[PDB]
Amino acid sequence: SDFVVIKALEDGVNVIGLTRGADTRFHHSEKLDKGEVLIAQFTEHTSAIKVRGKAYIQTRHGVIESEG
Amino acid sequence: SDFVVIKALEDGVNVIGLTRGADTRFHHSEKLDKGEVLIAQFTEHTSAIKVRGKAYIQTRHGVIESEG
Amino acid sequence: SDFVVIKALEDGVNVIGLTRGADTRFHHSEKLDKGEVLIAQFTEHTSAIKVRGKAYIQTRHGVIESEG
Amino acid sequence: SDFVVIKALEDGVNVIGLTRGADTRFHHSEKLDKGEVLIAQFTEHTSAIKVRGKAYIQTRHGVIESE
Amino acid sequence: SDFVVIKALEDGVNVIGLTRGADTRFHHSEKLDKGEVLIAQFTEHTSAIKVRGKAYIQTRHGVIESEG
Amino acid sequence: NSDFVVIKALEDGVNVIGLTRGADTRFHHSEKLDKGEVLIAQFTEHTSAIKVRGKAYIQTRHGVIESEG
Amino acid sequence: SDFVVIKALEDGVNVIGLTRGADTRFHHSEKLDKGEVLIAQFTEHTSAIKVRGKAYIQTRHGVIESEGK
Amino acid sequence: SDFVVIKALEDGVNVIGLTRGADTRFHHSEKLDKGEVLIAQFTEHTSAIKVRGKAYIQTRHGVIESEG
Amino acid sequence: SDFVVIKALEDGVNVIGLTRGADTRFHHSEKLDKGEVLIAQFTEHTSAIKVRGKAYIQTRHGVIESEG
Amino acid sequence: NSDFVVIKALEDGVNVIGLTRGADTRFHHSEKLDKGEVLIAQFTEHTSAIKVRGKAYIQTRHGVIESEG
Amino acid sequence: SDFVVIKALEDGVNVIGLTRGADTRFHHSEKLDKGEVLIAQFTEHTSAIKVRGKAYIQTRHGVIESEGK
Ligand SMILES: N[C@@H](Cc1c[nH]c2ccccc12)C(=O)O
Ligand SMILES: N[C@@H](Cc1c[nH]c2ccccc12)C(=O)O
Ligand SMILES: N[C@@H](Cc1c[nH]c2ccccc12)C(=O)O
Ligand SMILES: N[C@@H](Cc1c[nH]c2ccccc12)C(=O)O
Ligand SMILES: N[C@@H](Cc1c[nH]c2ccccc12)C(=O)O
Ligand SMILES: N[C@@H](Cc1c[nH]c2ccccc12)C(=O)O
Ligand SMILES: N[C@@H](Cc1c[nH]c2ccccc12)C(=O)O
Ligand SMILES: N[C@@H](Cc1c[nH]c2ccccc12)C(=O)O
Ligand SMILES: N[C@@H](Cc1c[nH]c2ccccc12)C(=O)O
Ligand SMILES: N[C@@H](Cc1c[nH]c2ccccc12)C(=O)O
Ligand SMILES: N[C@@H](Cc1c[nH]c2ccccc12)C(=O)O
């Protein structure tokens, strides 16, 4: 099952899980401060992930960067 | 399952999930502001995804860009 | 399961799902306006897809372009 | 399951599906006009696909052209 | 299942399916006229395929040509 | 889903011979190809080895090999 | 199942496993000192991993480096 | 399931199938004359194959030659 | 199932297996003298492995080196 | 569908020794090869380790290696 | 299932299997003299392998060398 790597490039970046299922709402928001790295799978509970704030992101499709 | 990465290049980009099944309709519209990134799977509920607004998109098939 | 990416290059492009099974007919036609992207799986209900109108298409086999 | 991409290069192209099973006959013919693209899987009901008319075809084994 | 692409380079090409099982005989011949393409799988009923007449053939192991 | 071999006859009377799967090994079928005909043949529940006699151009997943009559 | 490699680049690095399921919280924090390497899988109990502190990290998607506060 | 290609480079090349199971002995020898090719699988009955005589051999690990 | 290779670059390298499950603690420590190699899998009982001491390490993601 | 090793004897009397799978480990068979013969041998229900003694050229999925007598 | 190749570069190399499961102990030590090759799988009974003595080692991650005593 795949995962995504998120490195925060400033304080207060939010990595947000969206619920798997008929319903789509947030469920959890993990706060990363500058320099922290989160490596997060898709799961039974999470089928979409949003990143808000400035971060360096790696997936199986390559690098992408979110901007705050 | 496969997933798509979508980076909003302007405010109010919509990532819309179409229902899996005999019937096809929108079940969910996720609004991304400029610079946000959504990493979204195909799932039991979502078998097609439509992007409206300017965004940079990655899929297993490479890059493509939606335009406003 | 495989998917196809379709970017509409003009207004009114139609992405048409054909039914899986003994019977073959159109069960849905999704209209895309210019610059919209649709990423669409093969599914239990859809075993062939037809694109009509000017579009840029990616699949596992590479890029192809439909014309209006 | 694998699929074929067909792009019609002229009007009137036929993409014809052949029945899986002990017997072989055509169960559907989809007409493509010039510039339309069909992406079609092999399925429970279709184990062979015939293309008639001028089209650009892609499969996992690369490009081929019908005339 | 694997499949073979056969493009007929002259009229009257025959693509012949041989029965799966302890018995081997031809169960079907699909006749192709010049420039027709047939994309044919191996199946519960067809464990060998013979081509007669001039054709350009593609398989997973590359290109081969048959000559009449 | 099994592997397959492509055989192109380079002369008349080429034989593609199927050997039986199981405790018993014997020839169960011999397919005659004449010059320029092609046979694409799988390994199967009944065929666990394939013998080619005569001049033929053969492709497997391991590459090209040629049999000589 | 996938795993991540983490090499601590200073003392006191924490590799934090987050619980799998509807609930998200830290269930374990593994402390690494300078020079030590942890190779950790995703598991039934850990579906996200956070790294705090300076570390050199490899995953299937390539190298990334965490930086400490 | 894997297979070995054997091309006889002289008469009387012997391709020898060894029994799968707790016991090991040969259960079949298939002789090849010069220029014949044998493509043989590993099977429920054959878990090791010995080639005697001069032969050109392909396996998934490359080419090897037996000397007779 | 994945494995790591550990080559000890000095005496007393410590390869530490952490218990798989809701609880985390070490369940085994295998010490290596200089020049010894351990090739160890992830298993039902081990889901994280820590290396202490100077070692040359190979995994599917490349080479890494622990320092004592 | 297991892996297999290719052993080509470079001298007479090479031994390809199968070791028993399971809790116990012992030689269950030594196949003797003479110079120039090739054995292609799988891992199986009964054989989980293979020892080669004598001079031989060996191929496995990780490359070529040579045993010496 | 994966395997490792070990070629002894001196006499008396040991290839040691560690038990799979909750208990970890050596259950077998295979002695190789110089020039002999052992190709050994991970198994229901062995989930880690230690090599002691000078040996040339191939795994799916490439070449490694153990250095003797
Ligand atoms: N308990 C959460 C942990 C998690 C994994 N991926 C995430 C991405 C975003 C937020 C939380 C998560 C889950 O299993 O789904
Ligand atoms: N709850 C939705 C979440 C989702 C995943 N991918 C999406 C794409 C678009 C909109 C919503 C989604 C689902 O499980 O299907
Ligand atoms: N409800 C449709 C959605 C869909 C997927 N791919 C498509 C292609 C064309 C039209 C509709 C679709 C289905 O699950 O099949
Ligand atoms: N109902 C048909 C649709 C179809 C798929 N691929 C085709 C190729 C040709 C004709 C029809 C089709 C099926 O599932 O088999
Ligand atoms: N009804 C046949 C159709 C077919 C598939 N592949 C073929 C190759 C040759 C001739 C016929 C076929 C079958 O399912 O087997
Ligand atoms: N009836 C035979 C047909 C066959 C497949 N591959 C072959 C190779 C050689 C001879 C016959 C065959 C079978 O299913 O096994
Ligand atoms: N007992 C934990 C061990 C572990 C694996 N990966 C981790 C990452 C971080 C923290 C602990 C872990 C588990 O099986 O999940
Ligand atoms: N009946 C034998 C045929 C065979 C396959 N591969 C071989 C290699 C050598 C000798 C015989 C064979 C089997 O199924 O096992
Ligand atoms: N009867 C043995 C044959 C065998 C396979 N590979 C071997 C390696 C060495 C010795 C014998 C063998 C087995 O099935 O296991
Ligand atoms: N009987 C042992 C044989 C073995 C396989 N690989 C090993 C590695 C080291 C020592 C013994 C072995 C087992 O099946 O596990
Ligand atoms: N009995 C342990 C052996 C082991 C495998 N990999 C390890 C890594 C570290 C320590 C012990 C091990 C197990 O099967 O899990």
Tab-separated table of N, CA, C and O in Angstrom, chain A residues 6-10 13-14 50-57 63-68, chain B residues 7-8 34-38:
chain	number	residue	atom	x	y	z
A	6	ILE	N	6.334	13.800	3.534
A	6	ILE	CA	6.118	15.219	3.629
A	6	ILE	C	7.182	15.799	4.557
A	6	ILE	O	7.229	15.424	5.754
A	7	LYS	N	7.999	16.698	4.010
A	7	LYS	CA	8.912	17.499	4.844
A	7	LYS	C	8.405	18.934	4.948
A	7	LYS	O	8.231	19.645	3.927
A	8	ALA	N	8.196	19.417	6.197
A	8	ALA	CA	7.719	20.777	6.388
A	8	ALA	C	8.834	21.771	6.080
A	8	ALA	O	9.971	21.607	6.585
A	9	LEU	N	8.534	22.813	5.291
A	9	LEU	CA	9.583	23.822	4.934
A	9	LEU	C	9.412	25.124	5.782
A	9	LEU	O	10.199	26.083	5.698
A	10	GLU	N	8.331	25.154	6.583
A	10	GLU	CA	8.165	26.255	7.575
A	10	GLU	C	7.341	25.646	8.730
A	10	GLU	O	6.898	24.493	8.639
A	13	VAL	N	2.829	23.498	9.266
A	13	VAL	CA	2.295	22.799	8.062
A	13	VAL	C	1.297	21.740	8.588
A	13	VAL	O	1.497	21.139	9.700
A	14	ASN	N	0.223	21.535	7.841
A	14	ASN	CA	-0.787	20.544	8.259
A	14	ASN	C	-0.909	19.405	7.247
A	14	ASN	O	-1.105	19.665	6.067
A	50	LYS	N	-4.438	15.846	2.279
A	50	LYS	CA	-4.231	17.236	1.807
A	50	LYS	C	-3.022	17.805	2.535
A	50	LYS	O	-2.898	17.575	3.752
A	51	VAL	N	-2.187	18.616	1.855
A	51	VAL	CA	-1.139	19.291	2.559
A	51	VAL	C	-1.367	20.787	2.450
A	51	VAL	O	-1.577	21.308	1.342
A	52	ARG	N	-1.295	21.501	3.584
A	52	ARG	CA	-1.516	22.937	3.599
A	52	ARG	C	-0.270	23.545	4.248
A	52	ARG	O	0.183	23.053	5.289
A	53	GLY	N	0.261	24.620	3.683
A	53	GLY	CA	1.537	25.206	4.140
A	53	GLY	C	2.694	24.728	3.243
A	53	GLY	O	2.526	23.899	2.306
A	54	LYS	N	3.873	25.292	3.470
A	54	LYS	CA	5.024	25.050	2.587
A	54	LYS	C	5.742	23.751	2.929
A	54	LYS	O	6.334	23.571	4.037
A	55	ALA	N	5.697	22.793	2.007
A	55	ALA	CA	6.327	21.521	2.261
A	55	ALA	C	6.908	20.871	0.950
A	55	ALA	O	6.413	21.113	-0.182
A	56	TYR	N	7.906	20.016	1.165
A	56	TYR	CA	8.512	19.250	0.065
A	56	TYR	C	7.865	17.833	0.143
A	56	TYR	O	7.903	17.220	1.237
A	57	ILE	N	7.293	17.374	-0.978
A	57	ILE	CA	6.491	16.162	-0.949
A	57	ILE	C	7.020	15.109	-1.923
A	57	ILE	O	7.355	15.448	-3.027
A	63	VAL	N	8.510	14.304	-7.163
A	63	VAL	CA	8.521	15.404	-6.172
A	63	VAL	C	7.401	16.374	-6.515
A	63	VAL	O	7.095	16.582	-7.696
A	64	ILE	N	6.745	16.946	-5.485
A	64	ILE	CA	5.863	18.132	-5.702
A	64	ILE	C	5.980	18.988	-4.444
A	64	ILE	O	6.392	18.488	-3.424
A	65	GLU	N	5.663	20.281	-4.517
A	65	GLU	CA	5.878	21.215	-3.426
A	65	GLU	C	4.539	21.920	-3.204
A	65	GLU	O	3.926	22.419	-4.176
A	66	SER	N	4.062	21.904	-1.954
A	66	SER	CA	2.906	22.738	-1.606
A	66	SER	C	3.433	24.104	-1.130
A	66	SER	O	4.597	24.233	-0.674
A	67	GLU	N	2.581	25.110	-1.280
A	67	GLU	CA	2.896	26.524	-0.918
A	67	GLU	C	1.812	27.059	-0.031
A	67	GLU	O	0.630	26.846	-0.312
A	68	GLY	N	2.217	27.744	1.051
A	68	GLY	CA	1.269	28.303	2.065
A	68	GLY	C	0.609	29.539	1.592
A	68	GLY	O	1.192	30.158	0.728
B	7	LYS	N	-2.017	19.741	-7.534
B	7	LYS	CA	-1.541	20.980	-6.871
B	7	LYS	C	-2.304	22.134	-7.474
B	7	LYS	O	-2.249	22.344	-8.691
B	8	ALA	N	-3.074	22.860	-6.637
B	8	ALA	CA	-3.860	24.041	-7.083
B	8	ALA	C	-2.821	25.136	-7.474
B	8	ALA	O	-1.921	25.474	-6.670
B	34	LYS	N	-4.792	28.091	-3.697
B	34	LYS	CA	-3.554	28.191	-4.448
B	34	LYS	C	-2.441	27.587	-3.670
B	34	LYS	O	-2.189	28.032	-2.564
B	35	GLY	N	-1.756	26.578	-4.238
B	35	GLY	CA	-0.592	26.118	-3.503
B	35	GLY	C	-0.825	24.878	-2.675
B	35	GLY	O	0.159	24.225	-2.303
B	36	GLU	N	-2.084	24.565	-2.344
B	36	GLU	CA	-2.430	23.314	-1.679
B	36	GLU	C	-2.295	22.113	-2.569
B	36	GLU	O	-2.535	22.201	-3.791
B	37	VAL	N	-2.052	20.980	-1.946
B	37	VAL	CA	-1.872	19.724	-2.689
B	37	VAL	C	-2.827	18.674	-2.124
B	37	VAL	O	-2.919	18.488	-0.873
B	38	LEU	N	-3.503	17.963	-3.032
B	38	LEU	CA	-4.406	16.897	-2.645
B	38	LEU	C	-3.825	15.615	-3.289
B	38	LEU	O	-3.539	15.604	-4.492
